[PDB]
Symmetry: C3
């Protein structure tokens, strides 16, 4: 087709915003959650795995994720972007922009995992994990949801990655936390308050970059991007208030960490729904995502019993799940949503949402397990 | 009408930039000005009130600020954005983008106040204040200036919010500082130098986001946005140099805080003028705003006698006032400006500018007072 | 001509991104490399010289850099932007946007120098240096490369400033480090690890802003901007891995500083090549730039023998040189590049690249020397 310069402009900036989410967004976020002694190692691992993902994406990730193929993966006709004319158009933008935008999603997904596990995993081991998990979990899932694969064929609703990014990463991260133990030093049982401003800063950057993430998923600076933008604002705000409210009634006082976690919970929750729901649905998904996130990290604390950066997966996993399910409800026009596909009823959509969640959790869990084992058996996992 | 995708793209990014100003811009700015013990509380309050404002804005703020009504407020036909088709166009962009862009302005305005007072006001009290002040001061004033209200009917020139945002917030903030006392610990009489890099970082983020703030106010990626962009660069630079020069001749040495305050002074000063003046006028308003800001904080120091985050209101108020008045002068074509409205002479424009300033100061001062009293009488103000 | 709003939108945001690179990008970058005692002074100098450059740019920098004239400089027909209608179009955007975009390049270039030397040079002395060097080195070189000057007439390939920005600044910076000594306190021989997160944050911001820097140099949100965007991602990633690999085999372990330096090396390296090469060429230039950068700082360490912010010039200079030369190779279509100009062979292009490098190094070195001497003779250099 023909590229619309406005969309090209919008999508390259949105891509920049998404990249901003990982570098330095996620890094600053986790930087404030981990003990100073491991921050440098974590930043190094986030930076290098980010670089690794960028390369793997252009080499074959894009071709296998977005190339046409079967229900689980594409092809290798676009290795190193071969056979893609610079003027090739995907949707209403130059395919090259589509490559970068999609590549940035792969980056933040990996960032979510590495940023949390970096401190407990050997450097070479994380590299092996990234290669395996990106290649066998992210790419297939990305293809299944956005590459016209399985989940897409079933009509799974996931505007910006509730499954591909959040649930996908949350599971890979939780398995990592399960397989790799971590020694909590004395006095380091709770997140250091003095470092919370960095968590806030990371949260803020993720929030800002998330607009490129959510609105950019419209693929064009149109009314759907506008809707996604507004829902992102509302859902995030709603989740902050919801989490803070739940925390207020649960602890008698709100906390900075709670407010930030709430922001993330709403961002994760609205991710799959932003372009399919109305502002009213965004507010509701936001409040629920915030309360669900609080519930989620509270449960993780019962297991870990200590503040751990991996608590982040509790928010991404739970809110990712909540948002994905809620999308199946609020996508309805009766609720101000965009509507379901042909012959689709809310009941059927919910089931498809559950299937997507189910498949993502299992697929990512298995691939991650394999990834961690391969790393362990080769160079050794735990530091 | 029909939405121009280029403008949609421009305005959603500008909205992201403005949101960036509050989260984390203003938070980092104040974070570096307040004692470490209250930073966490301040960040929490900024985050939650930001969330609160985002919600109140979509629920009724937008409808009452931009809906058509009388000279002080709009209507409630757009509660929760009801009756607004996704494809509805406002100007040359989708109305939904207009909602978010305008909502982000409400957010930074509230951020300016809360970021400075957070450390001295009870959490629940700030929430009550925000609701009251946003609803009764920001919304009406926004409607009066940008919603076709009173000030707009009189031809008040305020491109991006010299009154709606800066003077409005400056007054609400100063009243707060007047009503709510603060105990200055020993050794905490001056801003901690070690924390100045965060003030610089906050300033930098405000500066960058300010381009979306000023240029985005053009409502379109046109020559007016270009002008506003260039004037923002120039006025900011001019104010930095002006403040630094004034500080150099007043103290024998420039300071980081002075350079940052200068940047803000120029940003505030050019805010109402950016799209109506020439680059020459921007440079002049910048130098004057910088010197006026220095004068302003110097006077506040004579009253407070101690470094206080509320000194920020001195810059916003004074430079806001200076910029608003200067707009009435440099908008003239003889001075390279865009020109005055029909039958308008510089003398008449100045008077209208003064009236807008006068009305904003009194309206905001009264509403803020009421807001603080209501909060005090209900849950208690001072921590 | 007629302005394309999409391009106007793209270019104003790209300009914002480039400005973001200096404020706070470069400031945070250097902030983490210099001892806390001089950070405040450095931030102040970066902020003020940034302001100074913004002003000098609008006053005469733009007219002399982009105005039509001879092979070394333009004219003064655009002083203070006089004679430039607001609706004047340059390329496909409003000239005013072109002014700001180009002005932001001048800002980051000066930022690269001041951020590194600030701690060792007197405040008034840096101001004098900036005026002299910006006026006599940056402007002429900018005119020579982008103002249709000498290097442009010879067909020098430099998409975003390998010479104008990086080599230009690297030389001016190295001369400064050569002329101005610095006392290294005991225990301050190596960069403080505790401050590395700020270097990472600065690097991240430079990286994100660099997209506006590289892609924006296309002057339009077209396929060339898309290519530049993708190459920036790839080259940066490749350089991170290359540097990290070289560091791993050279020291047995990667470091955060190495990963960040690698990012910069790739960004600098691809700068002149991004819009002329293929993704394959970007990856190769990236790996080479990363290894070359490591080699470069390693050599500087042999001379300085201590960690010094000026080591940054080693990366910009070397990678700038490497990227400029490599552009002459990978611009070839056989290599997936865009192709050489008329009657141009790779061999001839390489020579022209070398000439541009040669001329830039000498021109900047001489002007900087003069600048530092004038400053020294007038107010004194070293603090």
């Amino acid at each position: 087709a023909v590229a619309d310069k406005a969309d090209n402009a919008f999508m390259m900036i949105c891509t920049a915003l998404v990249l901003f989410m990982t570098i330095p967004g996620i890094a600053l976020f986790y930087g404030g959650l981990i003990r100073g002694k491991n921050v440098l190692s974590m930043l190094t691992q986030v930076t290098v795995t980010f670089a690794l993902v960028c390369i793997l994406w252009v080499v074959y990730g894009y071709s296998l994720a977005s190339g046409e193929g079967n229900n689980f993966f594409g092809n290798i006709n676009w290795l190193m972007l071969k056979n893609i004319e610079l003027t090739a158009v995907m949707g209403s933008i130059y395919q090259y922009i589509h490559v970068a935008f999609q590549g940035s999603f792969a980056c933040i997904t990996v960032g979510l995992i590495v940023g949390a596990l970096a401190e407990r995993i050997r450097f070479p081991a994380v590299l092996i994990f990234v290669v395996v998990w990106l290649t066998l979990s992210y790419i297939p899932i990305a293809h299944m949801v956005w590459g016209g694969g399985l989940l897409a064929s079933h009509g799974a609703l996931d505007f910006a990655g509730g499954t591909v990014v959040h649930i996908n990463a949350a599971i890979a991260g939780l398995v990592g936390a399960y397989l790799i133990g971590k020694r909590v030093g004395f006095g380091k049982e709770a997140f250091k308050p003095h470092n919370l401003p960095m968590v806030f800063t990371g949260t803020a950057i993720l929030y800002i970059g998330w607009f490129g993430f959510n609105a950019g998923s419209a693929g064009t600076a149109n009314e759907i991007a506008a809707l996604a933008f507004v829902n992102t604002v509302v859902a995030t705000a709603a989740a902050i208030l919801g989490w803070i409210f739940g925390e207020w009634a649960l602890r008698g006082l709100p906390s900075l960490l709670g407010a930030c976690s709430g922001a993330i919970a709403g961002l994760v929750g609205v991710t799959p729904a932003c372009g399919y729901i109305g502002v009213g649905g965004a507010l509701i998904i936001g409040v629920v995502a915030g309360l669900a996130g609080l519930w989620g990290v509270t449960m993780l604390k019962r297991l870990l019993r200590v503040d751990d950066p991996c608590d982040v997966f509790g928010v991404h996993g739970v809110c990712g799940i909540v948002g994905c399910i809620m999308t199946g409800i609020f996508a309805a026009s009766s609720l101000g949503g965009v509507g379901f596909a042909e012959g689709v009823t809310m009941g059927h959509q919910l089931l498809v949402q559950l299937e997507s969640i189910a498949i993502t959790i299992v697929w990512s869990g298995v691939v991650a397990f394999i990834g961690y084992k391969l790393a362990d058996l080769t160079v050794g996992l735990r530091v």
